[PDB]
Amino acid sequence: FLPGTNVEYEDYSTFFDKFSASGGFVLFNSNRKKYTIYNRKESTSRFAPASTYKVFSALLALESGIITKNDSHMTWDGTQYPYKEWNQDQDLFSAMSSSTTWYFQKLDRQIGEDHLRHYLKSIHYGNEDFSVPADYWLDGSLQISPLEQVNILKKFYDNEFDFKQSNIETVKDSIRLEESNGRVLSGKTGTSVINGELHAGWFIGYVETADNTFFFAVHIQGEKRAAGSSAAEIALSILDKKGIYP
């Protein structure tokens, strides 16, 4: 809850019910400096960021010179991963769309734990915790709340972290999804297994209009295998319900 704002509460249960899921929804109106949120408890509870963190992973990689807008290609070992989309030469842009985990992982390993921990502190990401370079953003060491996601996503968008203007734009393109009416949708999914047949899903991002910018984050928990997709669908139905994104 940024200083100099106001909060509103709404019920979107039915949108979550459609996917046999429970979770939260945080939306932020820049112009109105207003937050609209469903389920305050979930919206303020931290969870493993999962693939949602790739946005910042990518930003650190660029800022370090590990990769550039022009050269971000990375040939793949030959490892037969459980997902056919990971099993091929990746690109920063292809790794994001596909959440090709190995790409960012081998990206995080090049930077190292010391520089990694320093980073989480430099942008104060969630609890800022860390286990090992390979899975800190998946194993539950590092956690951030749906509300925290929105606030830091705005800091990224506005570049209050003062990173090279060029890299921000690069990460922005990597997650730009669609453009309808006069609005541009940007976002990123996240999926985590919480037990057993109970998965968690994330879908954060923002909507850019001609005179405004909406930041949103949805976090879910249910029996849906592809929680990341279901959370995106939920956020999207709600977004389309308030006429923010057609």
Side-chain angles (χ1 to χ4, degrees):
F1 287 145
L2 312 174
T5 60
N6 79 86
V7 180
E8 183 183 65
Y9 293 92
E10 288 183 53
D11 190 6
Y12 302 120
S13 294
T14 50
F15 290 106
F16 286 72
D17 298 344
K18 295 210 296 286
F19 295 90
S20 294
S22 77
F25 173 77
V26 183
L27 171 80
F28 181 72
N29 190 321
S30 301
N31 293 347
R32 297 288 297 296
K33 306 186 194 298
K34 180 206 308 301
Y35 291 98
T36 301
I37 53 183
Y38 163 59
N39 195 340
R40 196 180 186 296
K41 192 174 182 301
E42 282 257 4
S43 312
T44 42
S45 300
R46 278 164 168 154
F47 309 91
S51 276
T52 66
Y53 182 73
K54 284 177 171 61
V55 174
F56 294 83
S57 172
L59 184 58
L60 173 65
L62 292 171
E63 275 290 308
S64 284
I66 301 307
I67 51 177
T68 52
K69 152 68 174 175
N70 317 309
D71 185 7
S72 65
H73 184 278
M74 192 180 289
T75 297
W76 75 300
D77 329 65
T79 301
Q80 195 190 187
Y81 295 95
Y83 321 87
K84 225 220 167 187
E85 293 190 346
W86 291 15
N87 307 302
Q88 41 191 289
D89 291 313
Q90 294 293 162
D91 195 1
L92 167 68
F93 278 48
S94 70
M96 272 290 195
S97 315
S98 303
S99 291
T100 296
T101 299
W102 66 256
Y103 181 103
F104 299 84
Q105 248 169 162
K106 301 208 294 184
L107 222 48
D108 280 9
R109 290 151 175 168
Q110 200 175 316
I111 298 178
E113 172 176 3
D114 296 355
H115 294 320
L116 284 166
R117 299 208 180 209
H118 175 72
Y119 184 62
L120 298 174
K121 284 181 181 182
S122 70
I123 63 173
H124 198 144
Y125 190 110
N127 62 7
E128 291 178 347
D129 195 46
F130 175 120
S131 63
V132 301
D135 19 290
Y136 57 102
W137 47 278
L138 269 173
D139 65 14
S141 47
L142 180 60
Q143 300 189 177
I144 187 169
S145 72
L147 180 59
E148 276 172 343
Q149 291 270 207
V150 165
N151 294 330
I152 201 172
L153 263 169
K154 178 182 172 69
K155 281 205 180 62
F156 155 78
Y157 183 82
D158 294 348
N159 194 194
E160 299 170 56
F161 287 148
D162 187 38
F163 286 124
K164 291 179 290 174
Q165 167 206 290
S166 175
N167 302 323
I168 298 294
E169 270 164 43
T170 308
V171 171
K172 268 178 172 178
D173 300 315
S174 61
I175 61 169
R176 200 181 313 289
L177 298 169
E178 295 194 57
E179 190 190 314
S180 294
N181 298 188
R183 307 116 134 58
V184 179
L185 182 71
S186 289
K188 219 265 150 280
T189 59
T191 298
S192 267
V193 176
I194 63 181
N195 70 308
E197 273 285 11
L198 196 64
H199 304 293
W202 277 112
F203 188 56
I204 71 178
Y206 45 85
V207 174
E208 311 171 83
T209 67
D211 58 341
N212 208 1
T213 309
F214 295 85
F215 295 90
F216 61 89
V218 164
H219 178 277
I220 65 172
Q221 315 179 191
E223 58 163 300
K224 292 299 221 64
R225 283 279 193 156
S229 298
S230 296
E233 286 221 54
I234 293 173
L236 249 29
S237 69
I238 297 179
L239 253 45
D240 164 272
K241 186 63 169 185
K242 305 213 71 177
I244 295 170
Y245 193 67

